[PDB]
Amino acid sequence: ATYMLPSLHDILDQHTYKWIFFGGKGGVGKTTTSSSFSVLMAETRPNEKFLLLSTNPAHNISDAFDQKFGKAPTQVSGIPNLYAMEVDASGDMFGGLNDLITCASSFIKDGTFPGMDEMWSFINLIKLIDTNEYSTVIFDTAPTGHTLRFLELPETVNKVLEIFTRLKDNMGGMLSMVMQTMGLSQNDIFGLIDKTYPKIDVVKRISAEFRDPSLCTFVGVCIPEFLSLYETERLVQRLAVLDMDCHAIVINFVLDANAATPCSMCRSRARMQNKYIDQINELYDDFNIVLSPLRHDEVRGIANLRDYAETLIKPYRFCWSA
Amino acid sequence: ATYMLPSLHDILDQHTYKWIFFGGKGGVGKTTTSSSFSVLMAETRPNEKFLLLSTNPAHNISDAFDQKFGKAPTQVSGIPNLYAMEVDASGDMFGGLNDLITCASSFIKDGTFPGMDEMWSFINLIKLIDTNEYSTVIFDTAPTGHTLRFLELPETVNKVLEIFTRLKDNMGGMLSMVMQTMGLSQNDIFGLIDKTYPKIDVVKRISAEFRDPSLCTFVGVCIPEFLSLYETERLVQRLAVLDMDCHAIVINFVLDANAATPCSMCRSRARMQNKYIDQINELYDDFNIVLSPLRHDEVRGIANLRDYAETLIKPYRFCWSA
Ligand SMILES: Nc1ncnc2c1ncn2[C@@H]1O[C@H](COP(=O)(O)OP(=O)(O)OP(=O)(O)O)[C@@H](O)[C@H]1O
Ligand SMILES: Nc1ncnc2c1ncn2[C@@H]1O[C@H](COP(=O)(O)OP(=O)(O)OP(=O)(O)O)[C@@H](O)[C@H]1O
Ligand SMILES: [Mg+2]
Ligand SMILES: [Mg+2]
Ligand SMILES: [Zn+2]
Ligand SMILES: [Zn+2]
Ligand SMILES: [Zn+2]
């Protein structure tokens, strides 16, 4: 009843995608899967450019590729259309606009809203992306429970733009209060609003692309174990709240073993995994469910990232397959 | 040359310990190991009381124990001297002191130092711990790269107490500025400083216990793979910076396989693990290195947490052991 191909081949072939996120519990393969998929995209689309971004403060993209990446787009050895970059947590208009915001917000209740650094980090990031003309950006995220980088900016944008309105109108005398508090002219304050409003508008427009299922999708990564399914349920619910598309899950570390497998370790673990794979098949029956097998070695270097990518688009046949 | 028992038995038997942290890369077994060890402590010391705290916003202690825990100490089924609690991120003196701090700090450069919520979260936590009289608190931390909860408060304490000094002395007219800015009397400001200074002093005294190797130790958890050793090196360096003791690592998911093991998956993976275990044996030759074997099933429920704890103090004999 509506066979979903157990692969990311449809995502790979959907060239409208501008933003692709991979996420899930600690240790499930976010870095391995995002890195492998970004190689697959780059090698199948050599006439386009791609950016892999780590937003996990525990950056592991360098060690996955066995190549030193930095805080600026770095070209991947052997895949010259692929760039990788570490994004850290949180010009001089920043200082001025921030002070204007923090002062003006304290004129109303709950007026200490966070993520003004976030906004400026993100404005910088759009700088790079338009300049270098990437067709798609791939995110290697931090584990679930760690706040999703950039995904709440639409609510930040809204509070800033309403403050801009209040100041322009002198709503309840906020402008007078700010001028008298900061010793700025009406023209100084209007100058800060006017010069930065286009920057905010860009943030508004790209944040909307996160919520457009043609431009953005979020791929879940999990292991077939109680705690990882729990974290996956909570990631899927949080993405619904944020109006962001998630229709694909990669189940990683899948054992190629059954009741007839000699190894008693692989045999019993495969029994455990079977319960949780069936639970995922049931719960997410409209998703692409990709079975990424346990490999004989860690997934480091392009040869390994390439082999890992093959099972993202060519569904692996397990001894226990139908 | 200085045989370290490959177990946590010395830590288990060291009753001076008040604070024990478990940490490491995403997915390596922080929750499993902290939960198991906290059961072991509670069952070996039934006449004392123990608190297990999750500071991973992705709280998994409930699912590890298969018991619902909340935001207040919850008594563990079958282990009545053991309590478990989820600690979330960030009375009315809070609001007032915070406003006093944020105002007074802007009178000097870099005067926007973070973690005033942190401090108040922590003051609350010491409340519970002294009241309920726990001999030891065990922390299930967030992954490496995620900021270590409560461990930077000594530097927060210092900036607050110097502001207190400045205000008391009217250093460079900061007191006048604050009185005129906030419309408080000298006596109002002195009242806020005097009433909360004892609260700060408590934070100062307990933060110091984190840095006393008789009262506090940090146990590393890793898997024998490149990325996990990298994250472990970076956790160990960060704990040196913070003057916090780390002399124990648990290597988890260790395969009981060698060249003679029939299973080609377990045989090759054991070859990979062997390289990284030898690297850990070399690099951390003054540490307790505990080998926690891969188990046939996920570690959920007290029976499993108990079995897992046995290999924390009784070193497992592997087919490949000396
Ligand atoms: N299918 C697989 N078979 C074998 N090893 C794998 C597989 N997938 C990932 N690995 C290895 O497992 C480890 C964990 O993977 P990875 O670091 O990609 O996870 P993560 O979700 O990014 O972790 P973190 O939460 O720490 O960011 C790595 O050492 C990686 O090489
Ligand atoms: N030795 C082991 N053998 C088999 N399964 C294990 C072992 N240790 C842990 N597990 C299982 O592996 C999974 C990951 O462990 P756990 O959740 O404790 O790691 P963590 O470091 O707390 O992860 P996170 O970074 O998400 O907080 C769990 O499903 C747990 O039951
Ligand atoms: Mg990662
Ligand atoms: Mg955990
Ligand atoms: Zn195709
Ligand atoms: Zn003993
Ligand atoms: Zn096996």
UniProtKB/Swiss-Prot annotation, chains A, B:
Record keyword Cell membrane present: no
UniProt-annotated location(s): Cytoplasm; Endoplasmic reticulum
Binding sites annotated in the UniProt record for ATP: 25-32, 225, 252
Gene3D superfamilies: P-loop containing nucleotide triphosphate hydrolases
Enzyme's top EC category: hydrolase
E.C. numbers: 3.6.-.-
Binding site for Zn(2+): 263, 266
The entry's keywords: ATP-binding, Cytoplasm, Endoplasmic reticulum, Hydrolase, Metal-binding, Nucleotide-binding, Transport, Zinc
GO terms classed as biological process: protein insertion into ER membrane
Active site residues according to the UniProt entry: 56
One annotated GO molecular function: ATP hydrolysis activity
Leader sequence segment: none
One term under GO cellular component: endoplasmic reticulum
Protein task: ATPase required for the post-translational delivery of tail-anchored (TA) proteins to the endoplasmic reticulum. Recognizes and selectively binds the transmembrane domain of TA proteins in the cytosol. This complex then targets to the endoplasmic reticulum by membrane-bound receptors, where the tail-anchored protein is released for insertion. This process is regulated by ATP binding and hydrolysis. ATP binding drives the homodimer towards the closed dimer state, facilitating recognition of newly synthesized TA membrane proteins. ATP hydrolysis is required for insertion.
HAMAP family, per database record: Asna1_Get3
Assembly behavior: Homodimer.
Similarity comment text for this entry: Belongs to the arsA ATPase family.
Xref: NCBIfam families: GET3_arsA_TRC40
Protein name listed in UniProt: ATPase ASNA1 homolog
Naturally occurring in which organism (per UniProt): Giardia intestinalis (strain ATCC 50803 / WB clone C6)
